C-alpha cells in the first residue's frame, strides 16, 4: 500500500476532492488536518494556512489516482507525493484492497 | 530506524497506549495530534476526529511492536503503518537506540 | 525529492528556522503544525508540546541542510527525520527544484 501526502488551500476544497476520491473508491480514507505553510511563490517567500491531506490507497492505484487528482485539484501545481508503506498490519490492508476499486 | 503510524479515536486511549508503548520502551518517542478522518461506513463516507499518533522506534522492535499495539487498541482494525527512515541525523539515532530495549 | 520531519519546541523557533532554510533556499516549503510529545529523556518519560515541521527540498540537498538545522535548532538533539519520495508530479518537483539552490 502506500501514502499520499498533498495541501489544499481551504477546508472546502479539500473535503470536496477527498470525498470525490472516496465515491470513486481510489483511496480508502485520508487524514487531514491544518497547518501554517511558508513557501517560495514568484520571488517571494508566502505564509498561509493550509490543510495538509494523508491519502491511503494500494499501489497499483497510484498512476491512476495522481492524473485524478490533478484534474481535481483547485492549485494549478498541487504537491502530490507517494510514499511508499515498507509494511502494515494484514488486517489493515485487507480492508484498505476491499474498500478501493476492482 | 522506522515511524509508526497509527490513529486513535481519543487522547485517553492514544496517551494510555503510547505511554504503555513507552514505558515497555517499545518506542523511544511518540507525537500527538488530531485530524479528520474520511473513510466508507454504514455505506455512507463518514467524517470522524482523531488523534493520530507518530511513533519513532527501531526496525528490528516492528513485529514486537505491532503485535504489542494489536493487543492494546481500541479500534477493532486500526491502521498500523510502517515507514522506513531513510537517513536521520546520527546523534538523534544514538539516542533512540538507547532508549529502546535490547 | 524529500521530505524532512523535524520538531521544534514553539511557533517562534519553528518559524525563525523555517524562515532561514528558506532564504537559504535549502528547502522549497515548510508545513508546521502542532503536536504533543512524549519521549524518553534520562530515565523519565517527558512530556512536551511542540511544533512539528514538515520540510521538503531535492535529495542532493539532505547533508547540508541536516547540517544548517543543527546550527540553528533549539534542542541540542533535533530530529531530523529523511523521507524519501518514491514519486511526485513532475511539474511540482520542477518547482521544487527551481526554488531551492543549484
Ligand atoms: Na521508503
Ligand atoms: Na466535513
Redesign the interface.
Known amino acids: 500500500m ?2 499520499v ?1 498533498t ?1 489544499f488551500p481551504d477546508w472546502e476544497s479539500a ?1 470536496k476532492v ?2 470525490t476520491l ?2 470513486e473508491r481510489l483511496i ?13 511563490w514568484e520571488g517571494k ?1 508566502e505564509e498561509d494556512k ?1 490543510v ?1 491531506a ?1 491519502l ?1 490507497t494500494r499501489e497499483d492505484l ?1 498512476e491512476e489516482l ?1 492524473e485524478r487528482i ?1 484534474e481535481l485539484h483547485p492549485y494549478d ?13 494484514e ?2 490492508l485487507k ?1 484498505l484492497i476491499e ?1 478501493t476499486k476492482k
Open positions: 502506500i501514502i501526502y495541501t473535503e477527498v470525498k472516496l465515491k480508502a480514507c485520508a487524514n487531514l488536518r491544518e497547518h501554517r505553510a511558508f513557501y517560495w517567500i493550509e495538509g494523508i491511503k497510484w495522481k490533478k501545481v498541487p504537491a502530490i507525493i507517494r510514499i511508499d508503506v515498507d509494511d502494515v498490519n488486517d489493515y480492508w474498500e
